[PDB]
Amino acid sequence: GTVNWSVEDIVKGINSNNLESQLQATQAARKLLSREKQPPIDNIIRAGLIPKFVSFLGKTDCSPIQFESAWALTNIASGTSEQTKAVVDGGAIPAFISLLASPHAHISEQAVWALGNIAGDGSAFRDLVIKHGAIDPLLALLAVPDLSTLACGYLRNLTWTLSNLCRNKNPAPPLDAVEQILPTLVRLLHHNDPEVLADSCWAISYLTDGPNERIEMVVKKGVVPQLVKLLGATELPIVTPALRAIGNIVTGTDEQTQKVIDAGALAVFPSLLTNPKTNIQKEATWTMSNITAGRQDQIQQVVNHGLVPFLVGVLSKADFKTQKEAAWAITNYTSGGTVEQIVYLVHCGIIEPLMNLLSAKDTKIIQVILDAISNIFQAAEKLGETEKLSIMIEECGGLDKIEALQRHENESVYKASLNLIEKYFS
C-alpha cells in the first residue's frame, strides 16, 4: 500500500491537507528512506518535505504521523553532514526534544534516536542539542530504580545517544553537561547488556580523551574497577572501548595511572599483549608505554606482573605498528627505570629483538631504539659492564646496523649512532 511510492506521489499526499492522506504519504516516505541500498535522501530533501515532517512531529492527536515523521527524519539525519543540517535547519531539534516526554514509548525512542544522529554529526550540533535542553529529559527516561525494567532496545538507544553527547572535541562537551550525564553513565556501565556496556565504554573513552581535568571527573566517579572488569570481557566490542578508556586514563597523572594499577589492570595484560586482534595488541602496548613512563614503583609493578617478557614478545613478533609502541614502551622504561630494572630488561632478552628493528625504514622508531640503547649502556656503565653489552650487541648483528646507521638520511640518527660506536665500541 505504501511500498515503492514515487517522490511525486509522496509530495501530492503530504500537500493534500487531509491528515490521513498525509499520514499514508509520510509512511511511504519512511519506507523509501528505510531501504539500505541508496535511500533517496537527497530526492526527499529537494522535494521540500523536511518542514512538513517537522510540523507533523507536533500532531499530538495523530501519534502515527508523529512516529512516521520522526522515523523519516531520523533517516535523513543518519546521512551526510549536509543531510543532517537540512533536518536541523527545519527546526527538528526542539520538536524532537518535546517528543522525549511522549506517552508513546516508540515515539520517545524514535526522538532519542534522531537526536543521537544529530548530535553525532559533530561538536557544533552536539552542543546545539545540549543548548536546546535535551539532557534533562533524556536523563529522566533513565531515572528508574532498576534499568532492567526498560525495554532492551530503548535502553540501547538511550545509551548510544548519550554516548554521542559525550563524543567529539574542539571543543569537548560542556563541563556541566558531562557532570550532569556522568552519574547515569556510571549506572549504564554496570548494566548487563553487551551493547549498553560497549556504548557506555565508548562514552567513557571519549570523556577520558582529553586533559587531566576531564580524566579526573571520570576517575572520581569510581569507574576504574568496572573498566578493568570489562577489559576482561569475552566480547571484543566491549574490550576494545574498555581498553581505549584505560589507555586514555593512563595518559593522565601518575596518581590517575595508579588507580588503574590498583584496580588490577596489569593482570589482564598477558592476554591483551597476545590478543589475536592486532588492534587490541597495539592499544594494549600503547597503554603499556604510558605506564612505563610512570614512576619507578609503577615500572616495578610492570616487572612484578611479569609483563617484560610480554613486551619482549611483541617486539620480537607483532604487527609493525605494535612493535613501534613496544619500542616506545621500552624507551620510556629505560628513561625512568632504576639500574636494576633496566638490567632486568637485558636478562629478559630485549637486546636482540630491539636490534633487529634497527633495519626498519621508519626513522622515528630508530631514534627511539637508539635512545633506549644509550639508556641501557648508561645503566651498564654504573656497573662497569659496558663491554658485556657491547659484546651482546655485536653477536646479534646490532653493531653492523648501528654502523650502517652512521650513514642514514636523518642526522639525529647520525649523531646517535656515532656516539654509541665512539663511546662504547672502540
Binding site: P39, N75, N164, W202
Partner: peptide, 13 residues
C-alpha cells in the same frame, strides 16, 4: 579487524 563506535545509525526496521 577493529571495533569502532557508530557515528550515525539508519533505522531500517
Amino acid at each position: 579487524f577493529e571495533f569502532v563506535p557508530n557515528t550515525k545509525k539508519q533505522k531500517c526496521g
